[PDB]
Ligand SMILES: Cc1ncc(C[n+]2csc(CCOP(=O)(O)OP(=O)(O)O)c2C)c(N)n1
């Protein structure tokens with residue numbers, strides 16, 4: 001059953017919380033509004049129901065968390081100073097494989113669908129022009145390359161300080177996201193990369209240089225590794241093993257820096273990362289040399305958006321009221337926090353193995 005806890009603390013990213021605009025702790029203000037709205041809806045639900053109206057009313061707080069390992073480790077201690085947080089689904093699945101039932105998944109986030117990827121169940125087939133993942137990449141290129149990202153304006157792609165709204169369909173919630181593989185070069189180099197892909201010439205492809213995220217990343221490492229393995233069958237075992245024998249062919253960097261690196265021409269990223277990346281940023285994101293272009297090659301198989309997880313001993317009735325509070329806050333447009341992270345909706349997890357684990361496992365196969 002677990003103990004009713006009259007104080008609930010959510011872990012939130014440290015960097016995010018202490019981040020600023022104008023010298024101001026903007027996110028502090030956002031989180032306080034969110035916490036107040038949360039507390040009011042929670043206790044209304046709580047007190048409207050006989051099953052829970054006699055417990056103590058609950059206060060809601062946040063605490064900064066350095067990174068996801070700290071979140072999951074600290075939740076696993078089951079210390080009431082940290083009761084809940086929201087984690088990337090793949091990383092959570094891998095953690096729970098190692099530590100079964102140690103923490104309790106309860107909330108599934110959803111995100112506004114991209115106009116180019118509104119259907120979850122599209123998977124790798126053969127890497128040709130007719131491949132569903134290749135078709136999405138071509139739709140991305142119509143948005144990012146044909147209408148060049150560098151010339152997008154806040155006004156004509158509806159930048160709202162958060163995302164370019166014009167690349168989304170808010171009326172459709174996606175209970176998934178994907179990674180993607182970018183390629184960059186002049187015309188001759190792009191053709192050579194595409195030829196190597198088409199010919200399944202892994203050595204040649206790989207030697208164009210691959211940028212990636214950390215090896216525990218789903219969307220900047222593992223999902224793309226799966227596509228490459230499924231495409232260039234028999235040519236390698238794992239990306240880590242391949243890198244250990246070919247180290248100058250790999251570098252850990254964000255895809256939006258690909259254009260700055262002359263010895264790298266392939267990069268992994270979240271699908272549509274440009275959609276929340278302001279093109280005016282001083283980092284000059286996605287900039288390429290004058291006679292080079294960056295374009296999508298293929299996206300990956302889909303996995304669930306982030307999952308909210310509780311320390312094990314929070315009372316079940318309280319967990320379910322907290323889940324419903326997320327849902328109702330989204331419905332009534334009182335969630336000032338979630339949409340800043342891409343969380344545009346929420347659902348209860350009814351079956352973690354089916355709804356999360358099996359989905360993740362199918363994608364990395
Ligand atoms: C407005 C906005 N939309 C989208 C994002 C991206 N995003 C937030 S949660 C999520 C899924 C989990 O991704 P990540 O935490 O990068 O884990 P990884 O795939 O590296 O394991 C992503 C793609 C964002 N940061 N901001």
Ligand SMILES: [Br-]
Pocket residue numbers: 039040043
């Ligand atoms: Br209250």
Ligand SMILES: [Br-]
Pocket residue numbers: 043044047
């Ligand atoms: Br109340």
Ligand SMILES: [Br-]
Pocket residue numbers: 049051
């Ligand atoms: Br109830």
Ligand SMILES: [Br-]
Pocket residue numbers: 153154155156
């Ligand atoms: Br503008």
Ligand SMILES: [Br-]
Pocket residue numbers: 213214217220
């Ligand atoms: Br990463």
Ligand SMILES: [Br-]
Pocket residue numbers: 243250251252
């Ligand atoms: Br590396």
Ligand SMILES: [Br-]
Pocket residue numbers: 254255256269270273274
């Ligand atoms: Br990126």
Ligand SMILES: [Ca+2]
Pocket residue numbers: 005007008009080081082083
């Ligand atoms: Ca607590």
Ligand SMILES: [Ca+2]
Pocket residue numbers: 287288289290291292293294
């Ligand atoms: Ca260019």
